[PDB]
Ligand code: HEM
């Protein structure tokens with residue numbers, strides 16, 4: 001009996017705790033014998049579970065193309081994801097356009113506004129003594145951050161979330177395409193507006209940019225817009241929700257982060273290893289052998305990062321969250337040329353999220369009368385995290 005045969009990142013068996021982690025652990029155990037397995041899901045594809053096997057695939061850009069980065073493909077109409085859905089040299093040229101504003105020295109400029117924002121969000125419910133940490137904080141912190149990066153109105157998080165849902169989760173493909181078409185319409189307007197009155201934001205920047213003497217097509221710009229929006233409203237929101245969930249019941253982890261704030265960055269790294277929501281696909285472009293398996297052009301490999309992150313040959317006590325873990329060479333933010341662009345910014349954002357929350361609400365728990373909900377997908381993490389806590393006081397009247 002092989003767990004690879006019906007492995008499906010959108011349909012992962014959930015254990016009693018609410019998460020797919022029992023299943024991830026079982027699959028990790030099997031992968032010690034079989035690091036790469038065939039799944040009959042999505043018409044048939046390779047599932048890459050072993051840590052060193054994922055490293056081998058991800059370093060091989062000659063045989064594995066990022067044209068298959070989403071599998072099954074995200075609903076983005078005729079548009080593609082900039083950087084993430086491209087290979088070199090096209091890929092490298094586009095990333096260079098936004099390398100500078102995503103560098104650590106540039107993104108640190110947001111840190112104090114991130115603290116203020118997180119605190120203002122906490123204000124909204126602290127007097128109430130209950131709330132969904134996902135909808136209330138985990139979703140909102142990166143949505144607002146993302147809106148600032150894209151030069152969008154920060155109060156329209158619900159609109160941006162509807163678009164993201166269409167791209168990633170809506171099942172009816174007519175609706176999904178229709179709703180992605182709305183994004184495109186809003187994106188065209190914004191681009192036209194930044195064209196005449198540019199600002200400091202990333203969109204303004206890329207609109208004013210030039211590759212090989214030529215300005216980018218509108219479709220390219222829409223691609224930039226789309227992936228950046230995804231990085232925030234999907235990936236970060238789900239990661240932060242899972243973290244809030246863990247802190248809600250794991251009183252031992254919680255008291256330590258409060259007692260050792262100097263440990264928070266390292267714990268964020270460990271949390272990324274443990275609750276890293278993402279998996280990515282690769283399109284096989286030439287015959288290639290990895291370990292025991294020979295893959296063929298046209299086939300797709302899903303890189304199951306969460307399983308690699310629990311590989312006993314790469315991490316000691318992989319099933320434990322050890323906040324002092326170092327080094328921690330997890331794959332939650334990718335590796336190689338497609339390594340997460342947000343990287344340092346997401347670390348700072350997670351650090352601030354956690355620090356201010358524990359500072360304001362050091363005691364809380366899961367709501368016994370409302371259900372948690374895990375969202376399965378290529379990006380997987382908690383969607384609803386209802387909590388209760390002793391009523392507090394706002395900082396800002
Ligand atoms: C917890 C939050 C996040 C996680 C877990 C995550 C995960 C990842 C992973 C695993 C990759 C590798 C893709 C591959 O190998 O094909 C990647 C790439 C990428 N990420 Fe994210 N991400 C997060 C947040 C963000 C944010 C906030 C942004 C931007 C605002 C962003 C922008 C990008 C871009 C542009 C790429 C492609 C870079 C390239 O192709 O060179 N991400 N991400």
Ligand SMILES: CC1(C)O[C@]2(C)CC[C@H]1CC2
Pocket residue numbers: 069070081084227230231235278279280378379
């Ligand atoms: C899952 C992940 C990491 O996020 C996006 C936005 C970028 C790369 C892939 C696919 C889509």
